[PDB]
Amino acid sequence: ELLPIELDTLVGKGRFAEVYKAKLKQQFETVAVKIFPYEEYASWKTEKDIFSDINLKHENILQFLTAEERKTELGKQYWLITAFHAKGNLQEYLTRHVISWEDLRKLGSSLARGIAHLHSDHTPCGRPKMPIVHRDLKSSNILVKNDLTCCLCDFGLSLRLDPTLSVDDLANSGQVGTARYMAPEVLASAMNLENVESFKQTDVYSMALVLWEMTSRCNAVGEVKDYEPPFGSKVREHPCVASMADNVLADAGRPEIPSFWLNHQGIQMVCETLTECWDHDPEARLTAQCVAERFSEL
Predict the structure, then answer these.
(1) Which cofactor does it need?
(2) Distances (CA, A) of 277 to 208, 238, 270, 282, 290
(3) Does residue 12 have a known ligand-binding role?
């Protein structure tokens, strides 16, 4: 019943699981194996349920193969088998490479399309579908495909906006995610729980920081500095919510957009788009769909 898989190399370690480059015996196909210990069964079930939905299928969402339960000598493991993207995550890609305007346009539009798709109540063909909020969107969580387009993948903290969700259930999760990428209303514990979609606006803010990281490493601006994560020099390596709130909320701080970047007409449209997306007011932000339309115009 189990797939003939040989694990090769540990390529990543998340909060809930390890990721291995692996060989699937067919000749062989290269796949990624996400391995959860018994203790993280709930995160494995969450991702499996998200990936199992036939309506999720999209070019900017990681391709799911199967979920497996694997007995070991000293216990049991829970596996998620997915496509492998050799270029790795976007944060390491941006650290190592200076990108072109064409690359930025491809990465930026594909990210917005992937997020607009997750948030949508319909598939691209109009079939009803469960909206999903990512909740831990960041450059280290986005995969770079061989054609230099984004691929969303890490759904352990993601929330299916199920109509049966209670107000007490929505607050039960607490402050989930990475503090560096947390929207000001998330840092403030000021999330409007009377309406789910306030969750969609938090994904749009995190996406705006990712679009900034991409722009910051694009040669089209002219002079490109070394990669630094958003608010890199203002806070400690693994910042607490309090130090992030001092910057994002109290100091109204956003990653720096030097004026010379706006000399290029393309970078200008990008910088204006991501600026609306990181507004203090979640209701003043563009939707991921608005952002994808802006990229489809450029």
Answers:
(1) Mg(2+); Mn(2+)
(2) 5, 24, 11, 8, 10
(3) yes
Residues followed by a break in the chain, C–N over 2.5 Å? 26
Positions annotated as catalytic residues are: 136
Helix (H, G, I), strand (E, B) or coil at 61: strand
Elucidation technique: X-ray
CA-to-CA distance for 6 and 141, rounded, in angstroms? 24
Domains of the chain: residue spans and CATH: 1-86 (3.30.200.20), 87-298 (1.10.510.10)
Structure tokens at 12: 């990543």
Record the resolution, in angstroms.
Answer: 2.0
Pair 46, 99: CB distance under 8 Å: no
CB atoms within 10 A of CB 144: 23
Q: Is 13 annotated as a binding residue?
A: yes
Q: How far apart are CA 7 and CA 23, in angstroms?
A: 6
16 in a known ligand binding site = yes
C-alpha torsion sign, points 61, 65, 66, 71: negative
Determine phi and psi for 131, rounding to 5 degrees: -65, 145
Tell me the CA distances in angstroms from 51 to 126, 190, 253, one per residue in order: 19, 30, 36
Nearest to 254 by CA among 184, 176, 185, 201: 184
The DSSP code for 278 is T
Measured from the Cβ of residue 183, the count of other Cβ atoms closer than 10 Å reads 27
